[PDB]
């Protein structure tokens, strides 16, 4: 069709979101990642010890291997995967493309093999950063956008509940008010943008924040000055070297965190900042430092409170409060 929708479900602690997709004759759970442009899956070529417990892709009669083509990717958390390439039909909630480049994994790192629900990733960043060699391939979105009613996809990730990915249209029953747009900087292949300011509780700052919208990143990673300022308002909070981040008494009161985009205020409920248990009655925070990255990453912790529209016509990004 010219439009389509599909359910996406979080894994424990909302660490990542999984979406069922049909690759060839196989239905797999993939992590939709706007932070990368490679669609790769666990397959019959993946060593048995590494694909144990995962559903996988087996090239069928509709598959055609791209001779001499290879891919290799490294992610921000150090994880990785590599293999060869096939072209096959891929269907996402009714929307299909018969010649999508499917990257078959021959090697996959431990971060991926342990989480049995994750059978690969579907990249939604700009195709300019696809890693296939010698010739780069296009993302599923770039291949189908011309056939969609509108060249866009929107996402409504939810906290410990079913959410949705919309293709070709915006679902007015998923958000309230109107959508506010901001320009996108895709010079580095990502959905980069700049927020006009932020607020810790009611303390608002005119300071600007530049970063990327990444469905494939768990937390909200920002500059140390903002991170430190946030936890100064959280009694009992302190940096824990063993866990690699700020933690605080599970009973502590957490202030809301907001980012200003134009005349719109995107607010992250303090309750969502309580990310995970770390023992001793303490909780690991949903907001941590972007140290090293070089820029901020608006991950799931942030995205799960908004209905976000990724518009390729601009490129532009749209935000609205979830309904």
């Amino acid at each position: 069709a010219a439009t389509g929708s599909v359910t996406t479900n979080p894994t424990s602690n909302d660490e990542e979101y999984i979406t069922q997709v049909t690759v060839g004759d196989d239905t797999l759970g993939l992590d939709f990642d706007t932070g990368s442009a490679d669609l790769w899956v666990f397959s019959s070529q993946t060593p048995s010890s590494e694909r144990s417990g995962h559903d996988y892709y087996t090239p069928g009669s509709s598959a055609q291997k791209i001779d001499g083509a290879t891919w290799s990717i490294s992610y921000g958390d150090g994880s990785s995967a590599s293999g060869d390439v096939y072209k096959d039909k891929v269907t996402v909630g009714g929307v299909s493309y018969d010649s999508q480049a499917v990257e078959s994994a021959e090697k996959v790192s431990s971060e991926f093999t342990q989480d049995t629900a994750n059978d690969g990733l579907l990249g939604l960043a700009f195709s300019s950063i696809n890693t296939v060699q010698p010739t780069p391939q296009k993302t599923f979105f770039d291949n189908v956008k011309s056939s969609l009613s509108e060249p866009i996809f929107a996402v409504a990730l939810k906290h410990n509940a079913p959410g949705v990915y919309d293709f070709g249209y915006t679902d007015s029953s998923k958000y309230t008010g109107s959508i506010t747009y901001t320009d996108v900087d895709n010079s580095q292949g990502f959905w980069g943008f700049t927020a006009d300011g932020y607020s810790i509780g009611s303390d608002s700052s005119s300071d600007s924040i530049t970063g990327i919208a990444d469905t494939g990143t768990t937390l909200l990673l920002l500059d140390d000055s903002i991170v430190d300022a946030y936890y100064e308002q959280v009694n009992g909070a302190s940096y824990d070297s063993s866990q690699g981040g700020y933690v605080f008494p599970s009973s502590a009161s957490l202030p809301d965190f907001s980012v200003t985009i134009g005349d719109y205020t995107a607010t992250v409920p303090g309750e969502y900042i309580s990310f995970a248990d770390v023992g001793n009655g303490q909780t690991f925070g949903g907001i941590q430092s972007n140290s090293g990255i070089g820029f901020s990453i608006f991950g799931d912790v942030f995205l799960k409170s908004q209905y976000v529209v990724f518009d390729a016509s601009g490129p532009r990004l749209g935000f609205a409060a979830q309904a």
Partner: peptide, 6 residues
């Protein structure tokens, strides 16, 4: 957590 293609 994870951080997806630096």
């Amino acid at each position: 957590x994870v951080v997806x293609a630096x």
